[PDB]
Amino acid sequence: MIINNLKLIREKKKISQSELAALLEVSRQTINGIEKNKYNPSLQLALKIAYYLNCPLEDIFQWQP
Amino acid sequence: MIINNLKLIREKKKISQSELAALLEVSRQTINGIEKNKYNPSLQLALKIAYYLNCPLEDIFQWQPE
Numbered sequence: 001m002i003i004n005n006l007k008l009i010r011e012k013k014k015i016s017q018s019e020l021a022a023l024l025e026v027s028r029q030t031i032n033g034i035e036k037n038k039y040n041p042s043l044q045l046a047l048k049i050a051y052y053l054n055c056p057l058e059d060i061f062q063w064q065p
Numbered sequence: 066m067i068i069n070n071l072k073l074i075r076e077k078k079k080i081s082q083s084e085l086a087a088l089l090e091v092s093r094q095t096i097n098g099i100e101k102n103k104y105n106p107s108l109q110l111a112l113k114i115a116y117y118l119n120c121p122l123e124d125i126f127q128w129q130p131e
């Protein structure tokens with residue numbers, strides 16, 4: 001019930017997974033897992049992802065009732 | 066570290082803790098713990114809070130860059 005646009009946005013910005021993972025200090029596998037909807041990040045990791053992609057968080061992770 | 070403004074925004078909007086809790090389907094203790102900086106709201110809960118408070122999530126929850 002959270003939609004995410006992480007892969008689309010990352011790719012539009014021409015950032016690789018390995019590049020984003022290093023900024024975030026997480027495994028590339030964890031970025032990939034999020035992109036593929038296998039699990040969601042904690043709030044802090046989500047905020048760091050938004051910070052390093054320079055997009056509002058709700059552009060990347062969307063919830064709606 | 067995340068700094069949050071939930072108390073301030075909630076009270077400016079005249080929403081009580083139990084009111085917010087009901088709307089979000091969580092306990093009042095959960096809302097209070099976020100506001101007393103005990104408790105870490107999940108990404109989903111944070112998104113629900115931003116949705117109903119109708120503020121950008123980063124107005125409510127701010128990561129301190131590090």
Ligand SMILES: *SCC1=CC(C)(C)N(O)C1(C)C
Pocket residue numbers: 008009012013053054055056059
């Ligand atoms: S930062 C917002 C943003 C950038 C871009 C990748 C061009 N987008 O499609 C959105 C609007 C998400």
Ligand SMILES: *SCC1=CC(C)(C)N(O)C1(C)C
Pocket residue numbers: 073074077078118119120121124
């Ligand atoms: S929605 C943004 C917002 C509303 C109000 C509660 C009046 N605020 O102080 C901010 C700017 C957080």
